[PDB]
Design a protein around this ligand. Structure first.
Ligand code: MG
Lengths: 319, 145, 50, 225, 221, 48, 79, 219
RNA sequence: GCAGAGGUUCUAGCUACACCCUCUAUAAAAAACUAAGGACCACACGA
């Protein structure tokens, strides 16, 4: 083919050389790829994952559990059982995915948060489901974007994946202290539509007992989502030595802003949900939540805010 | 690739070095307004010498305390101008740097763990926005002062 | 021309109509845009990628 | 056909070879899902060796990207046809117009995040009415090369396999035409001299449409051949 | 409270009718309409075709001479026919046609109970003079949509995706009633669209039983 | 997980045993690299 | 089940020695017949070790002294 | 074909009596949303309950006013009243008086019985008094309503939350009994003012919904 | 069950990653079972 034939130095240098092709980064087992799916019902500590992919990746674990439970005497019979996809095999599979993190991995892993751990949720289908919040961290679209899944094997590997690589453990990007799981595209639009006001909207003017009454009025349909109404809130502040004090007052606001109040944790003040709540406002909100409440309350609050943003963006119909 | 490979030998090997050296962090001015305030420029880094407010001989912030959100908020209301801070360059640790000379992990709200590889973290942080980059009188006072 | 074509049928000239939620059953505020757009199906099926 | 288009879909479909354009006008004497017979008009036929036109539409055929090159008749019996007219709707073609996809109702609104950033949400109605079911033709080719210590046979005698797998195969070890095989099934029985039979890849399924066998001269062909 | 009743059933067309429920108060109208629409569109017992055998067609993708279109289009047309049965849960329909002419559903050799509600539904067109198609259509009752790839023998048997769903478009409107003397009463009118295999009255009555049974988790009947 | 033949076999036997314990060993790609650099005429070896 | 390991890393302020100590704990639970002190809730060893660390009764010092005592009565077993 | 996978209660987390979280595992596809929305609307827009609707202050006639000696405006005073959960007997209306004076909070336990009217929250706070000579007295009107009647649709007018529920939110995720389809797993978190148990309130709502289809059960 | 052979099946089956029993020079009362190979260059496409 009239081409330079590879020498003893062409296989030690270059991209295709042994160093950068087989030593610096090498192909691995227990790995699978598929296109990604939103699946908003997930929590960022977990991700969707097809049954076939969990069956193929966790084949040694399934064989071990089958041997332990005596369903199959031998690896060989157990392997045949995995091929038959017998119903008993799926129940065994659900046991090895209870607390076994997998490393979701997009191909152009530009930064540290390119690969993150997730607790796989067995889904029927063939597309991996990636939590909506971590898409910004992954810089991952839903336009045929494929990301590999790797299975940590040893207790050290799974344990350190859970302790470090979990999306719950990666809230602030290594580049800057700003949060990386911030509501990015659609949930932020839902929150922005939620936290606004008509100067004349249905159910404007009456005083509300609290956020529960605001939700009751909005769901019943007798009050608009964003109408300037005075509500009573039990705002919690930790100005004490770690103790949270309660302040109750009638802050003029809208119904939509009152809806978010039940989502936010206790520590956050009401001044953070009383604006239009754009992308920058939500980023500042999440940063304050991380710096005040901590990590677990921030994770729960992010999940709840994602849920409400998606739900009320669907209810908004922002065409 | 170049950034990662000039790095990857630099990990947080120590916890402190007792070095008074550092870099005097000052909000950057390029003729216009304040591009980055000192609050967002020194946050998460451990100072090298005691910062002082207009009152002299005042230990507003001690020598070796990490500047978290509370300290930075205190700095703004005390109207500080320049804060000397312990820089990773000034660290005298061999085959690595100490935790104090680096500062906050930028991913967790605490000092960097003793051991964590920060060279690769820095290289990836620098190289990640590379795809988002591009390729191609008289002096008038702005406000009262 | 498109507005006149919508006016030819019973459909509104604005091009977007009120839609009711499938689950909740109450109409979405701010009527959403609907229509019959020609969208393909690429040969990058998920079956090939597993 | 696309509800909204450009008008070049007809030009693209006619100019391309996917469809069966009519070289000469006339009337459709006989139309079939596999062939179309056109009776050329008296003023459009040569004095000698004119006869009538016969079009053999290509049925389900394996394509370069494993798709079906299917040509369905677009005319009925007795329908007049003029010169340079479309007669068979080839792949992605409807009434002589290039019909790549399939148009459907589309509502632009966020929906509970299931169309979060660029993802598409599809109703059960689309799947139900088979709007996007696409036939994919796979080319699973089995080869019987020369082997040391004697060659390998294509018979149905395969060791260490069950009778259920061999049920699909015929008496000569070749899958019956039209059989609906599944993932991991066996298609043609080939055993190496001392179990190298061709098998369906795991996951993929479908029904065999035809099994063509090529045998070199000199070696006797089996029963299926 | 008030009890909705079958005040009127406007059979406007052969396929789709307009059922009316009269007594309802605030909320009930929309709530009951949406619940009934979701129950109808979700799970209504249809009798769609699920299995077809042709006299001399080996598989789904082949083609026999004399037929206008492919066997695949024949199967997809067969899925579109609306057929309802009365006694048997399972029935086999034999279709024997010969000569030139479209093969409509009217020529199906129906049994005593099974009957085609849309005899004009065309299946295939025979073109050759000596062209005859003989198919054994297997029609069984079912609920919802189940594809042929997610179910459960001879090579000559052809599987068509099941489409057990008599209803295709359920639209309800809540408007004020015309009671003798009262206010805040709305009537629910449902513009249900069916292929013709289900009676709108019995369809509505069945949807309510399914909802009532699901409700029975918290309520004694 | 990639190239240690003894490591891969031991890991498989361990996971099917139920003890997710890593027998590290050494990647065979590094041994390939050592052989290729040696074949150039450059002794590259390891100290014990 | 667990979602985050925050309280664990306020218990062990290293985020790295935590992985090592919980890995040793999981190894003891799997290879050995060691009974986890916190009763499991259908949880794997790698997460029940983190649960043990969360309550603060298991860390590097307690694990080290416990295994040292076990070795001590291992010498003392044969007197 | 008429057989359905009827749900069975699996675990009802009993939060404090003012809150509950009821869930069902089996159910059916698309039926989780149907049942959740039906219950939510049926118990959030129409329920037989008792709540305050109209208050009259002896010394105040106009809303834009405030008594001396009370730190809470009468705008806020009615706000506490609308949250006063009250249960009544067969009588459809009763006037409740709150004649009280002296320095101290005015708890709901100080409401005169005026019969067998029961207040489920005796410790509920209505207003605070800071002057010994200060006296507060108002008449409370309550009716057995059937939903929510805002004051904007109608003497001090206070929003009447007749229904005992305070918050309903159903989340529908996936639950696969055995190995079937991803059937709906309805989980309903409920908060009630206290007049009835949230479980009892959900049961009452379901009885109302089924009792709305008495003629539609095929005999 | 670690070095070999035999057994009821089906040529051969001794842990070969591999499945049952016997002993150290001898072959059968016995059901679930079996196989351990595989590069580079170009093209097109997706992110
Ligand atoms: Mg993309």
């Amino acid at each position: 083919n009239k081409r330079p034939l590879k020498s003893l130095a062409d296989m030690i240098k270059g991209k295709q050389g042994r160093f950068r092709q087989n030593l610096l980064g090498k192909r691995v087992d227990y790995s699978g790829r598929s296109v990604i799916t939103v699946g908003p019902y997930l929590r960022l500590h977990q991700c969707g994952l097809p049954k076939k992919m969990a069956l193929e990746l966790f084949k040694p674990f399934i064989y071990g559990k089958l041997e332990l439970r005596g369903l199959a005497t031998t690896i060989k019979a157990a392997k045949k059982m995995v091929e038959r996809e017998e119903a008993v095999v799926w129940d065994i599979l659900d046991e090895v995915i209870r607390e076994h993190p997998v490393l979701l991995n997009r191909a152009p892993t530009l930064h540290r948060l390119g690969i993150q751990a997730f607790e796989p949720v067995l889904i029927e289908g063939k597309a991996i489901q990636l939590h909506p919040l971590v898409c910004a961290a992954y810089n991952a679209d839903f336009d045929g974007d494929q990301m590999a899944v790797h299975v940590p094997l040893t207790l050290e590997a799974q344990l350190e994946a859970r302790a470090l690589m979990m999306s719950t453990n990666n809230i602030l990007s290594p580049a800057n202290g700003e949060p990386i799981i911030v509501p990015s595209q659609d949930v932020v639009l839902g929150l922005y539509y939620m936290t606004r006001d008509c100067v004349n909207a249905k159910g404007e003017g009456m005083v509300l007992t609290g956020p529960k009454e605001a939700e009751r009025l909005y769901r019943s349909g007798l009050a608009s989502l964003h109408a300037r109404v005075k509500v009573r809130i039990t705002e919690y502040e930790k100005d004490a030595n770690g103790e949270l004090v309660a302040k109750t007052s009638l802050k003029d606001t809208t119904v939509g802003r009152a809806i978010l109040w039940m989502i936010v944790p206790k520590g956050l003040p009401y001044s953070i949900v009383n604006q239009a709540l754009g992308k920058k406002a939500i980023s500042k909100m999440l940063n304050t939540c991380y710096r005040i409440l901590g990590l677990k309350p921030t994770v729960i609050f992010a999940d709840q805010i994602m849920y409400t943003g998606f739900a009320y963006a669907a209810r908004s119909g922002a065409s | 690739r170049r950034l990662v490979d000039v790095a990857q030998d630099l990990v947080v090997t120590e916890d402190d070095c007792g070095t008074h050296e550092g870099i005097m962090m000052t909000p950057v001015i390029e003729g216009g307004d304040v591009k980055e305030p000192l609050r967002d420029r020194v946050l998460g880094r451990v100072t090298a010498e005691d910062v002082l407010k207009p009152g002299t001989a005042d230990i507003l912030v001690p020598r070796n305390t990490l500047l978290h959100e509370q300290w930075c908020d205190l700095l703004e209301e005390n109207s500080v101008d320049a804060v000397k801070v312990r820089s990773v360059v000034s660290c005298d640790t061999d085959f690595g740097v100490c935790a104090h000379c680096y500062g906050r992990d930028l991913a967790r709200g605490h000092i960097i763990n003793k051991g964590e590889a920060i060279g690769v973290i820095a290289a990836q942080s620098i190289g990640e926005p590379g795809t988002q980059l591009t390729m191609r009188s008289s002096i008038q006072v702005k406000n009262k002062g | 021309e498109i507005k006149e074509l919508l006016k030819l049928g019973d459909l509104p000239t604005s091009g977007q109509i009120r839609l009711y939620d499938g689950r909740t059953g109450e109409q979405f505020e701010r009527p959403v845009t609907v229509g019959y757009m020609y969208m393909l199906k690429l040969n990058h099926l998920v079956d090939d990628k597993m | 056909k696309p509800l909204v288009g450009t008008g070049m879909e007809r030009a693209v479909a006619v100019d391309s070879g996917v469809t069966a354009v009519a070289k000469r006008g006339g009337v459709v004497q006989y139309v079939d899902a596999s062939r179309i017979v056109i009776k050329v008009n008296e003023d459009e036929m040569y004095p000698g060796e004119a006869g009538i036109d016969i079009y053999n539409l290509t049925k389900y055929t394996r394509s370069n990207q494993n798709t079906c090159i299917n040509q369905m008749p677009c005319v009925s019996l007795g329908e007049p046809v003029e010169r340079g007219d479309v007669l068979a709707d080839g792949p992605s073609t409807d009434l002589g117009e290039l019909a790549l996809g399939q148009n459907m109702r589309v509502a632009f609104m966020p929906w509970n995040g299931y169309n979060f950033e660029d993802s598409i949400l599809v109703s059960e109605r689309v799947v139900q009415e088979d709007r996007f079911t696409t036939i994919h033709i796979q080319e699973l080719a089995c080869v019987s090369r020369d082997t040391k210590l004697g060659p390998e046979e294509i018979t149905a005698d395969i060791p260490n396999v069950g009778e259920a797998a061999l049920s699909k195969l015929d008496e000569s070890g070749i899958v019956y035409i039209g059989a609906e095989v599944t993932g991991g099934d066996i298609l043609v029985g080939k055993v190496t001299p001392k179990d190298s039979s061709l098998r369906v890849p795991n996951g993929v399924s479908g029904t065999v449409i035809d099994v063509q066998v090529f045998t070199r001269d000199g070696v006797e062909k089996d029963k299926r051949a | 409270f008030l009890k909705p009743r079958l005040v009127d059933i406007e059979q406007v067309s052969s396929t789709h009718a307009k059922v009316t429920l009269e007594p309802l108060e605030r909320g009930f109208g929309h709530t009951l309409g949406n619940a009934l629409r979701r129950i109808l569109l979700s799970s209504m017992p249809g009798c769609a075709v699920t299995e077809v055998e042709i006299d001399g067609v080996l598989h789904e993708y082949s083609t026999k001479e004399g037929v206008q279109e492919d066997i695949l289009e024949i199967l997809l047309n067969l899925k579109g026919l609306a057929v309802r049965v009365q006694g048997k849960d399972e029935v086999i329909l034999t279709l024997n046609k010969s000569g030139i002419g479209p093969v409509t559903a009217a020529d199906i050799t129906h049994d005593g109970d099974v009957e085609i509600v849309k005899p004009q539904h065309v299946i295939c067109h025979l073109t050759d003079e000596n062209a005859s198609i003989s198919m054994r259509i297997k029609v069984q009752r079912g609920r919802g949509y189940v594809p042929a790839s997610t179910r459960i023998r001879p090579i000559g048997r052809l599987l068509v995706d099941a489409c057990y769903s008599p209803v295709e478009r359920i639209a309800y409107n809540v408007e004020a009633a015309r009671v003798e003397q009262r206010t805040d009463l709305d009537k629910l009118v449902i513009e249900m669209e069916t292929n013709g295999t289900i009676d709108p009255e019995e369809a509505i009555r069945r949807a309510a039983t399914i909802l009532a049974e699901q409700l029975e988790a918290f309520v004694d009947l | 997980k990639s190239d240690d033949v003894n490591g891969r076999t031991k890991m498989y036997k361990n996971i099917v045993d139920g003890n997710h314990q890593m027998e590290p060993g050494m990647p065979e790609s590094f041994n390939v690299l050592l052989k290729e650099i040696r074949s150039l005429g450059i002794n590259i070896e390891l100290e014990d | 089940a667990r979602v985050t390991v925050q309280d664990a890393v306020e218990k062990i302020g290293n985020r790295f020695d935590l992985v090592l100590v919980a890995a040793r704990r999981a190894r003891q639970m799997q290879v050995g017949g060691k009974d986890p002190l916190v009763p499991e809730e259908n949880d794997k060893t790698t997460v029940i070790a983190l649960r043990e660390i969360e309550e603060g009764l298991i860390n590097n010092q307690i694990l080290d002294v416990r295994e040292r005592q076990e070795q001590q009565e291992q010498e003392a077993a044969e007197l």
